[PDB]
Design a protein around this ligand. Structure first.
Ligand code: NAG
Ligand code: NAG
Ligand code: NAG
Ligand code: NAG
Ligand code: NAG
Ligand code: NAG
Ligand code: NAG
Ligand code: NAG
Ligand code: NAG
Length: 501
């Protein structure tokens, strides 16, 4: 008997600034979903400063968005008591959604925004410097010089990239020094430095190099070796019968298992996974309780579902990432590696009401070494399509019922892929967007459940296990004709690669 109230302060202009929920110094109504659209002038952002904030737990949240149109962004998801940071917008419209539960009504929030030109983002400094990602600017002599100057490392990042590359794993060797880009030569190019250059680019070893001729007027730089392991770029423009380096680099540690497994046919009735059969499956415990799994994509980064970390991102220290998790009742094994979380980044295009863009990055506390039972998952390459009917394996600790006991050992099962058209024909309730992929049997039996959220949809391709899905939502478990819908990682590859660097 508590319906969502409609008719609150939707449109808020410039003089009308000091807004708040209904009866702010009191208890707000439960099951309320209110929206405070913050209109502004064309060319001014929104700066919201919460004067007093004391909400309920993760059950009730305040979601701040910067939509301005049908496709809404995501700025912050605040919850819990205590002061919060001032959200800095980028457009003239900000949506403040108040998601509430049915019980435990807390006090409420109150804020006063302000419209200005590029608020939050600091003013750009003099043009003779290079601005980092945090707004601070450093002199041009301090970028790409082998010494970290930016707080995040923007001066020493993206100092070399592929040029004239037919694929994302080869091309030229254009370096950047003193804020100018230029190619290299092949007079003294060996194999001992090729793998080093490939590692600097964020790739594997060097396959081969095909120097032909120079075609650009850039001041190509000579490259030599060094006994201390430093790629020296001798500043000079003088070379006879030169040639641009067409360097070919291999991929990084991809989805290659290192355990000694056997062959066992199990399609219908998938049993437990052997110790070390899925090294890129990471567990996430929030206060001594597994909620949603994660996929190891780098040495310190994890990809998890955005619906379980929704509201639990304010305090990343409460999470605990268990790498090499095999049994839920025995963590004293030498293969289990515990780590903490220090940063949780939710996808900007996430939408809990549409279950779209369900993906989230989680930074680890300390970097973890790769072992025989811990290996990173392999991100799918750009412009890669997975055909339907492809039997891809999954992994997780799903429970047979909502409030029962889950499997102690890691469970795994193979499910075939489905097209979006047939999936929508099978699920007339939900909404299947162009960033989702459905997989599962229409006859039931092999179906995911709670506890497998964020689990990877591992599809093997040329002896390599890629990442073709992240668990987003699903209907009731143990029901036929209800395939699991996962977030299509192929559409979020660049968003993850922008953070892995
Ligand atoms: C603020 O809102 C009230 C009603 O919500 C409206 O009458 C008024 O014109 C708005 N602007 C002000 C007070 O500057
Ligand atoms: C909100 O609180 C008061 C307004 O009474 C003001 O001093 C403060 O600067 C405001 N913060 C903003 C507008 O971000
Ligand atoms: C290679 O680089 C040259 C620059 O001189 C450019 O004109 C050309 O389009 C690039 N690609 C190919 C395939 O030649
Ligand atoms: C480059 O290659 C030539 C070829 O003999 C060699 O004499 C020279 O020592 C190498 N290094 C430099 C810096 O020229
Ligand atoms: C290099 O590329 C080829 C494909 O042409 C591949 O077979 C090989 O494994 C790669 N690595 C090495 C070291 O040859
Ligand atoms: C947990 O694993 C260790 C090492 O594998 C083993 O010694 C211990 O007996 C296990 N715990 C239980 C309850 O079996
Ligand atoms: C991981 O690799 C580093 C690099 O040498 C090493 O110092 C460390 O002992 C290794 N093991 C762990 C648990 O960090
Ligand atoms: C999936 O498994 C079934 C079981 O017989 C098989 O017929 C089908 O070919 C498999 N799909 C792929 C892509 O291997
Ligand atoms: C999602 O909902 C819209 C209505 O806003 C509808 O037009 C669309 O067909 C739905 N998506 C699917 C896959 O049916």
């Amino acid at each position: 008997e508590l319906p969502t109230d409609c008719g609150g302060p939707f449109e808020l202009w410039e003089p009308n600034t000091t807004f708040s929920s209904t009866n702010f110094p009191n208890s707000y109504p439960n099951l309320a979903f209110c929206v405070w659209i913050l209109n502004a002038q064309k060319g001014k952002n929104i700066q919201l400063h919460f004067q007093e904030f004391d909400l309920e737990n993760i059950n009730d949240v305040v979601e701040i968005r910067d939509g301005e149109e049908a496709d809404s962004l995501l700025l912050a998801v605040y919850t819990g008591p205590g002061p919060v940071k001032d959200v800095f917008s980028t457009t003239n419209r900000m949506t403040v959604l108040l998601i509430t539960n049915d019980v435990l009504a807390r006090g409420g929030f109150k804020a006063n925004f302000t419209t200005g030109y590029h608020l939050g983002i600091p003013e750009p400094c003099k043009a003779d410097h290079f601005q980092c990602k945090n707004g601070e600017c450093v002199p041009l002599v301090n970028l790409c010089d082998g010494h970290l100057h930016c707080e995040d490392g923007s001066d020493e990042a993206d100092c070399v990239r592929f040029f004239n590359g037919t694929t994302n794993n080869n091309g030229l060797v254009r370096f950047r020094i003193q804020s100018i880009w230029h190619t290299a030569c092949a007079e003294n190019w060996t194999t001992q430095i090729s793998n080093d250059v490939c590692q600097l680019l964020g790739l594997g070893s060097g396959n081969s190099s095909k120097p032909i001729f120079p075609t650009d007027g850039g001041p190509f730089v000579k490259l030599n070796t060094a006994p201390d392991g430093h790629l020296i770029l001798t500043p000079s423009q003088q070379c006879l019968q030169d040639s641009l380096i067409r360097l070919q680099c291999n991929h990084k540690s991809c989805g290659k298992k290192l355990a000694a497994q056997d062959i066992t046919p199990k399609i219908v009735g998938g049993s437990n996974a052997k110790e070390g059969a899925w090294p890129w499956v990471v567990g996430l415990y929030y206060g001594g309780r597994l909620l949603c799994g994660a996929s190891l994509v780098s040495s310190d980064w994890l990809v998890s579902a955005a619906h379980c970390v929704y509201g639990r991102n304010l305090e990343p220290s409460k999470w605990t990432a268990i790498l090499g998790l095999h049994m839920k009742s025995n963590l004293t094994s030498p293969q289990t590696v515990p780590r903490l979380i220090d940063e949780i980044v939710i996808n900007p295009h996430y939408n809990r009401r549409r279950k779209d863009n369900d993906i989230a990055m989680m930074h680890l506390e300390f970097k973890v070494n790769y072992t025989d039972y811990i290996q990173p998952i392999c991100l799918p390459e750009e412009n890669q399509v997975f055909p339907p009917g492809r039997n891809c394996s999954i992994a997780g600790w799903g429970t047979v019922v909502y409030q029962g006991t889950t499997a102690n050992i890691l469970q795994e099962a193979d499910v075939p892929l489905l097209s979006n058209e047939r999936c929508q024909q099978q699920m007339p309730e939900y909404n299947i967007t162009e960033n989702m992929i459905c997989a599962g049997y229409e006859e039931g039996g092999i179906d995911s459940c709670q506890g497998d959220s964020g689990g990877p949809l591992m599809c093997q391709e040329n002896n390599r296990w890629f990442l073709a899905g992240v668990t987003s939502f699903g209907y009731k478990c143990a029901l036929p004709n209800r395939p699991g819908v996962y977030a299509r990682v192929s559409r979020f590859t660049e968003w993850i690669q922008s953070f892995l660097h």
